[PDB]
Design a protein around this ligand. Structure first.
Ligand SMILES: CC(C)N1CCC[C@H]1C(=O)N1CCC(n2cnc3cnc4[nH]ccc4c32)CC1
Ligand SMILES: CC(C)N1CCC[C@H]1C(=O)N1CCC(n2cnc3cnc4[nH]ccc4c32)CC1
Lengths: 294, 280
């Protein structure tokens, strides 16, 4: 008889599946731990009219990127960056919505005239809401910093990278850190630096530092790293972290940002109690800021 | 004629003997007759700022007189200065022990331990903290005699301790918890470093059993900037270097007395001398 062929079934289109051949690289948006994010135009018509997207690719760690994809795919919150889809090659890429204003680290220095204290406190509430949503799903972020917070508009921010995000086991209080060589130490709580234990309260400490960055408009000369290095000394090399732990044990903290009212600084100080159990919660911070806003 | 004054024009560089913190030591022949018959000497000069530190080390060594402390011979003045010491051809215990295992038994290792303790006790009695006691800094005078051979980090105690400022190149795996956590160096901190030096001696300075290799296996070797806090956490938990192979429990128990978490609970050098002498 004639040569046989397979009956072709109805070919359905998945809007979350992005073809590699149409993902056209524009520029880098940031280097993460296992991956890197690039601005791409997904252009299936090949005429430079396609939608712009943020694409996360591996820089070995495919299992970690797959885990980050599955976390983000299932988060639905207005202050959390939107998952758009994937690009499958065993390799995989994470496709997200692109926010042209970029991160608060890039946005704030260029927009000081436009952003007053009231707008800074609204961003602080939005970061707390996104973080509380994450905590309620039993996740620890581990990388909350202004460079990871994106600007949706002048009125809206979104948490924008989940490269270090880990699930806390049910009925347990923290995640035990193994990979720590590239830890953002100047945003880390003492229990993270001393025992490699990450709690939801550890994310609250990182929020306090993120709030300090927002209030200083992310100026590089007032950055948490620049300020802590001036306090402890910048020539300690491998001894930097123990000197940082010793300074924190002594009760020393980042100073009140210029023009920051004491009532805002007092909420910031509640994020920095030495013991995780004595720290404020994200829900208590939302109430505190809302009271200062109205 | 000053016999402690060495003319630069007569010092012939031969080879390097070791790199320190602010300086480096070189083997030289001091040859004023220009016929290669001159005496061989160890010369410490600054690494090409820190002249004040080298001058301080020279003045410390010049005034130490002990059979288990390397002999000061003199200086070479240019502001510049070089430290002249006697040369020990057998070099350090780090170089000597791996090549002489057959010749050095437990009894000889315990005699070296007594000698290191005596030299260290002499230093402590002059109110100095060494801060760099390790097998690589102990020289072999002969099969029967060792001498502490570098004083690059040696500081006078005013008070019970010296507060450390320059610490980026700290030999962390030889350091007591108070040094790692608070940058405070006591005489008891030198006792902790001696315990680690004793472990090196007992393992014949083999690189695969070195205090760094053993601690890195315990804590993990991929922690980068987090290594020291992971080391502090392991020490806080009560974890210590294991008993060297073939080391009797009675020797290991003396070693463990150097490693009490609190400096005040640690053995003294005088108590270690008595302990080893009893075993000998
Ligand atoms: C994770 C940390 C270690 N790195 C340090 C440099 C910025 C940060 C990063 O890699 N990102 C990913 C890209 C982000 N980004 C910047 N502009 C963006 C615009 N749109 C975006 N959509 C998803 C991410 C994203 C954007 C900033 C945070
Ligand atoms: C101080 C530490 C950080 N360094 C790491 C390498 C060895 C050590 C050193 O610089 N020295 C100085 C030279 C010493 N040395 C080696 N053979 C020697 C032979 N004779 C010597 N007389 C005085 C020192 C000396 C000798 C060993 C320790």
């Amino acid at each position: 008889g004639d040569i046989v062929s397979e009956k072709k079934p109805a070919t359905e289109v998945d809007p979350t599946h992005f073809e590699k051949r149409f993902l056209k690289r524009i520029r880098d948006l940031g280097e993460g731990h296992f991956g890197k994010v690039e601005l791409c135009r997904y252009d299936p018509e090949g005429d430079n009219t396609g939608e712009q997207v943020a694409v996360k690719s591996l820089k070995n760690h495919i299992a970690d990127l797959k885990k980050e994809i599955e976390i983000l795919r299932n988060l639905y919150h207005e202050n959390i960056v939107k998952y758009k889809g994937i690009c499958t090659e065993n390799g995989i890429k994470l496709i997200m919505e692109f926010l042209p204003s970029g991160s608060l680290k890039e946005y704030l220095p260029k927009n000081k005239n436009k952003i007053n204290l009231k707008q800074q406190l609204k961003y602080a509430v939005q970061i707390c809401k996104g973080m509380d949503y994450l905590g309620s799903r039993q996740y620890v972020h581990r990388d909350l910093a202004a460079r990871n917070v994106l600007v949706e508009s002048e009125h809206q921010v979104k948490i924008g990278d989940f490269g270090l995000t880990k699930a806390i086991e049910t009925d347990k209080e923290y995640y035990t850190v193994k990979d720590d060589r590239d830890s953002p130490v100047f945003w880390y709580a003492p229990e993270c630096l001393m025992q490699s234990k990450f709690y939801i309260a550890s994310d609250v400490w990182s929020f306090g530092v993120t709030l300090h960055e927002l209030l200083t408009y992310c100026d590089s000369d007032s950055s948490p790293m620049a300020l802590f290095l001036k306090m402890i000394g910048p020539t300690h090399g491998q001894m930097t972290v123990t000197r940082l732990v010793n300074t924190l044990k002594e009760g020393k903290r980042l100073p009140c940002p210029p023009n920051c009212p004491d009532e805002v600084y007092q909420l910031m100080r509640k994020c920095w109690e030495f013991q995780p159990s004595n720290r404020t919660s994200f829900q208590n911070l939302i109430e505190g800021f809302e009271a200062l806003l109205k």
